[PDB]
Write a protein that binds this ligand. Structure first.
Ligand SMILES: C[S@@+](CC[C@H](N)C(=O)[O-])C[C@H]1O[C@@H](n2cnc3c(N)ncnc32)[C@H](O)[C@@H]1O
Ligand SMILES: C[S@@+](CC[C@H](N)C(=O)[O-])C[C@H]1O[C@@H](n2cnc3c(N)ncnc32)[C@H](O)[C@@H]1O
Lengths: 278, 278
């Protein structure tokens, strides 16, 4: 629990959110409410999502007796389990532990929000904006960039929090692509997971792993049962996989150097041959 | 004019060529025709390229009146200035002084051939096939390997030639990659040359040289002129180069131990930031 305490950084974060007076703002991790009290003056409603019941009670107390108190709803509990309401904008200062699952939750949330202004550890922020093959380019980079426009807005020193964290922080903007690309995110993430796990291995090597071959063969057999496709007696899932890698040109490539165009082509090429990822 | 005169090595070279009866064989440097007369019996056509008109005249005489004479075409002159016809396989024994230009001629030749079996000086051969970082791993190794598969096939003692060369020799196989990487060679070689000057020192030391910083700043300014990108007054090429090396993880890497995909990645990292080596 690192409380953002520098008023200038808080004001800049709120400015970057470009609030409208009619906005519902989702605030995740309100801490002691340093940002909440300012958000409440600028928006129609603030929905603060907070894990710790003590910090919930104290937030209610902080706004008690003020003209804006009635514009605050506090949702108690783990945000990752919460069914999130409609919101226009999100500001968030969450622990590093939940940064990844929260980004994915945001990317799939409906109805679409307009933007999110988020505080993350520096490395996590750099990963979100990394290009092919930066050292920090990973599943997080490509999944975020597929579904959203993501920008690194500002560096924030550890000195700005109480108590200070051990690493520097960053403010990032995430604006979800609306409509999103016409791509099944579950399939996409299956392919991305498999190829990035060892992002430095060629795809040929990545797909040779027993765990990979076993699931892909199982799902392919299910596929064929649905679509009435004969599987020869001498079927080899290794050969089937390798011929797709060859035909798409990605066999000798490594996920760390592959962009969105590349993975879309690869996914298309697996799908055309009956391989569908979970 | 070192003429190969060991029939067993001649037989072994022809064997490694894996001739098909329908093949057109380019033989560069046929000498006295020791290999030519054997090639003619196994291939559809032999196109022999020879610089010395005296040897050309003797080669015609050697096949004269034999049943395979009509399958021989002799192209007279410098093979480097010769527009080469289609050929399936190539066999070559040329002076050491033109090994490098001839290799890159073959690699740029279209349509693609299937394989070349070539005689080189020992050290030249060891450089072609060197792996990151064998002692002899160099610009020649990586430039050749970018475009071809290369194998050292056999050592050839100087006594096998008349007259003998001053050095030991090797037989190498070259098979062009088809398709090749879609990399502009002048661009690629710009990066390769720079980094291989001191192949045992790091990339950040290679990129700190005055002349290199001047080149890259000049090229970035050209890219920015093309795209109408404004360059701030306080622009630092040193800083921009360092950020790219840090982003990609290459600051402390050395050309002697970098493979092809390493160079592709580094080149992409510069090019995507507007910095070109051509
Ligand atoms: C004080 S911030 C720490 C983040 C840090 N400043 C950083 O660099 O990003 C953590 C806040 O989020 C709350 N929080 C932690 N986990 C949560 C969760 N799963 N759901 C909702 N709120 C949570 C904490 O109780 C606290 O209010
Ligand atoms: C190159 S010489 C010497 C080869 C020697 N065994 C070696 O490894 O260096 C063998 C043949 O190549 C011919 N030759 C030399 N330069 C040539 C060129 N530029 N184009 C075509 N043939 C050439 C010579 O006349 C001779 O017939």
């Amino acid at each position: 629990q690192h409380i953002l305490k520098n008023p200038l950084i808080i004001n800049s974060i709120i400015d970057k959110a470009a609030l409208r007076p009619t906005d519902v703002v989702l605030e995740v991790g309100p801490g002691t409410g340093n940002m909440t009290v300012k958000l409440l003056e600028k928006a129609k409603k603030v929905v603060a999502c907070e894990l710790d019941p003590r910090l919930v009670a104290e937030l209610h107390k902080r706004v008690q007796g003020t003209p804006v108190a009635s514009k605050l709803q506090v949702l108690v509990g783990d945000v990752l389990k919460t069914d999130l309401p409609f919101f226009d904008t999100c500001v968030a200062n969450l622990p590093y532990q939940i940064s990844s699952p929260f980004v994915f939750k945001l990317l799939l949330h409906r109805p679409f929000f307009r933007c999110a202004i988020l505080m993350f550890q520096r490395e996590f922020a750099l990963r979100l904006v990394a290009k092919p093959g930066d050292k920090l380019y990973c599943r997080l980079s490509i999944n975020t960039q597929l579904l959203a426009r993501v920008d690194h807005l500002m560096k924030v020193g550890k000195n700005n929090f109480r108590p200070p964290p051990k690493v520097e922080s960053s403010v990032v903007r995430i604006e979800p692509k609306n409509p999103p690309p016409p791509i099944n995110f579950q399939e996409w993430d299956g392919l991305v997971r498999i190829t990035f796990v060892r992002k430095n291995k060629t795809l040929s090597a990545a797909f040779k792993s027993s765990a990979v071959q076993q699931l892909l063969e199982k799902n392919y057999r299910i596929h064929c049962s649905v679509h009435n496709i004969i599987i020869p007696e001498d079927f080899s899932i290794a050969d089937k996989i390798q011929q797709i890698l060859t035909s798409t040109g990605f066999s000798d490539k490594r996920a760390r150097s592959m962009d969105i165009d590349d993975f879309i082509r690869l996914l298309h090429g697996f799908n055309a041959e009956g391989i569908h990822f979970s």
